């Protein structure tokens, strides 16, 4: 289930946040104007950047505590406004987190594990009302 | 499911309030002592007290309103704050709710009215946790 999702994600962090991450970008190119030191980067030139290894596991690392600390895929209201008050936030709306998790869904259901992947779509849409709740727009 | 079984219970509130609530203190009788004038007296005697019915109609008043502002039955922390902190609930424990969504599911089982049983059972243990999380022993 869901809780296993996240002993399962957070035991080949590194592997998922970089393969959910470039999921992400893959599906909306136009994403990746956000993170302007990878734009004109294969996927193998990125893994060789010590920032992106870096910036998405990290990415993912906090994304698995909101997770951990929710109850029934609710995220913690704290935590959505963690999200909103991040300054490398500052330009995002919720459609930008929606899509984070659309891909994120998609490529779980795509993967050969066993992702309880509509508990991470309800997820992602507790998260999304939670993000606009906070003032995110 | 859920949110229709709030409008189901609100349409006809006194009658499910009181027959849930004597559900509950006929299940555990022991329950009565939180309160005042209530033992030694059959179901229709508690139900012709002055009382009663108005005290288990607020009851369920509150009740629906908490499960109505609760997402994937995931109550308010805020709500649960106030449970906690009513002056009229300073004797009680987690316990006394377990117990009382313990005897609502099984009045729910064994009705003729469509519930949403596994859903009224989630909410009460995500309430009795919120309960615990808001400093209730
Ligand atoms: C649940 C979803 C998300 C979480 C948990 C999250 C978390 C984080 C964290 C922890 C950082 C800081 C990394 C560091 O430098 O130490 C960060 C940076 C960033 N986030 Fe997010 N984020 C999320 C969604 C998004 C989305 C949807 C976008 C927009 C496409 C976005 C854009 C960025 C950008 C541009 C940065 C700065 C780039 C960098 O780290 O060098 N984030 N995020
Ligand atoms: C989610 C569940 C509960 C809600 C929403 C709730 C709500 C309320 C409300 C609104 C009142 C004031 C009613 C009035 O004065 O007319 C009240 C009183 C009271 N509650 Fe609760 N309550 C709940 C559970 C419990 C439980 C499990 C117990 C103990 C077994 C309890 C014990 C009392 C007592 C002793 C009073 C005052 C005495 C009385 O009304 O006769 N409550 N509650
Ligand atoms: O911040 C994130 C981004 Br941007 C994309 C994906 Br996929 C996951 C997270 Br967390």
């Known amino acids: 289930g869901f809780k296993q999702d996240i002993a399962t994600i957070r035991g080949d962090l590194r592997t998922y946040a970089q393969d959910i991450f470039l999921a992400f ?47 029934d895929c609710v995220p913690l209201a704290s935590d959505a406004n963690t999200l909103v008050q991040m300054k490398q936030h500052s330009s995002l709306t919720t459609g930008n987190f929606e899509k984070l998790f659309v891909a994120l869904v998609e490529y779980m259901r795509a993967s050969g594990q066993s992702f309880d992947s509509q508990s991470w779509d309800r997820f992602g849409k507790n998260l999304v009302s939670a993000l606009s709740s906070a003032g995110m727009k």
Not at 39 to 66: I, R
């Open 25 to 71: 970008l893959n599906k909306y190119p136009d994403e990746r104007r956000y993170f302007k030191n990878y734009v004109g980067k294969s996927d193998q030139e990125l893994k060789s950047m010590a920032k992106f290894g870096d910036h998405t596991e990290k990415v993912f690392n906090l994304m698995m505590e909101v997770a951990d600390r929710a109850t």
